[PDB]
Design a binder for this molecule. Structure first.
Ligand SMILES: Oc1ccc(C(c2ccc(O)cc2)C(Cl)(Cl)Cl)cc1
Ligand SMILES: Oc1ccc(C(c2ccc(O)cc2)C(Cl)(Cl)Cl)cc1
Lengths: 10, 236, 241, 9
């Protein structure tokens, strides 16, 4: 759910 | 399974890291030199938040990083983010003795740290690191190596082979740069040691800074982005 | 300065000769222990170790060339890192355990408060020492590097900068000594540089552990259940948490 | 200062 997860994938 | 990072040459490594470098960002253009704790920490927090986004995209371009699982990537960045922001700050500040160049339009000195409780100690540590780098004549090619070492090293023992192989590659790269710079054998290993020992102080500054950020959080005066909040919370 | 005139072999010999003793704790396997009394044991041990550490520091080449004020500073900054690396060294041959003392060998289960996170980091460092097959000669070099390096950037005058200059020269000598040892052990030049980096990167993790420990120690003081010794309290306060 | 004293003797 972490934002960092999303950013690392984006 | 095999990582492309290990097959690169020293020069290829240097060029990849140089090319991955994030941009130097600006602060708000208001000419009011911050003297309040609020406006001070407000500007720095805003800047840090934007820098973090670039850092995340920088990390993905460090050879060997994307070979790690997402979870490993998250762990490394959560552990290293403040160290990385700080070494970057120190590097930018190197040619400005006595000043911290947070941005081209935000150049601060220790007196301005005095207005934020607990910040003057951190400013002094940063300034000392900057001076040390300047007196060592740190090169940009060495700087990008050190920054990548921080990314890979700081969280590696809170989890390995892949990471340590890459770290070895970067060590090879540093020595390569020093030999290319004409240093003798004894000068090479002595300089390698001097540079790596500074990483201990950078870790120390990050730890102290993290404590300061946590207090700033509980004071609830300056709003923190969800991103910055999640990075901070990772340090318990 | 006698320090800057030492050969690599003399430096190793000097450091080995200065090694402090391994002390015992008051642990009694038949006695029940609370989290509080277990931490009382470790606090007691640390306090006793500190006295030996102070007298060990005096025997590290270069250290007594510094002013009393500078010696005080280096030790205030490095004390917990030094205790921790010593603990990690003693534990290297006991996977999963921390050998606080010959009569006190703990696993992470005996970490139960917040000490558990620190135990885990210490265990990982020991595991790392084992992975690397850290040698005793390399260990004593690393320990002296910590003493000299940790406080060197947190020290007035242009003269007071000369004090910092001497330390860097001694540090370089210890680097030379490390390289000398690896060369003797048959390592290639590439291997020597790689291993030197590996060893020095560990010091970053030791700094981290010390910082986390320093915070736990401060919280213990405030909870005021586990009595800290007077020397320990003064060392802790030197960090102004 | 305890540490200070121990460094002396
Ligand atoms: O490029 C940088 C920007 C901010 C910082 C810090 C920082 C980080 C996060 C914040 O919310 C505020 C300041 C300090 Cl702690 Cl040095 Cl002011 C460090 C480097
Ligand atoms: O040889 C050692 C003894 C105690 C310690 C620490 C220590 C230091 C001071 C104390 O009051 C309690 C524990 C921990 Cl927190 Cl790692 Cl157990 C470290 C190494």
């Amino acid at each position: 759910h972490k934002i960092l997860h999303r950013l690392l994938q984006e | 399974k095999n990582s492309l990072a290990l097959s690169l040459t020293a020069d290829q490594m240097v060029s990849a890291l140089l090319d991955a470098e994030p941009p130097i960002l600006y602060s708000e253009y208001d000419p009011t030199r911050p003297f309040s704790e609020a406006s001070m920490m407000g500007l720095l927090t805003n800047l840090a938040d934007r820098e973090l986004v670039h850092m995340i995209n920088w990390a993905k371009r460090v050879p060997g990083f994307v070979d790690l699982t997402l979870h490993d990537q998250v762990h490394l960045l959560e552990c290293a983010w403040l160290e990385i922001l700080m070494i970057g700050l120190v590097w930018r500040s190197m040619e400005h003795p006595g000043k911290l160049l947070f941005a081209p339009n935000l150049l601060l000195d220790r007196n301005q740290g005095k207005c934020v409780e607990g910040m003057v100690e951190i400013f002094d540590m940063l300034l000392a690191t900057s001076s040390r780098f300047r007196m060592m004549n740190l090169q940009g090619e060495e700087f990008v190596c050190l920054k990548s070492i921080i990314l890979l090293n700081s969280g590696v023992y809170t989890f390995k082979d892949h990471i340590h192989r890459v770290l070895d590659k970067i060590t090879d790269t540093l020595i390569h740069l020093m030999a290319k710079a004409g240093l003798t054998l004894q000068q090479q290993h002595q300089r390698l040691a001097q540079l790596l020992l500074i990483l201990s102080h950078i870790r120390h500054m990050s730890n102290k800074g993290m404590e300061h950020l946590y207090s700033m959080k509980c004071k609830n005066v300056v709003p923190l982005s969800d991103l910055l909040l999640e990075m901070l919370d990772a340090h318990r």
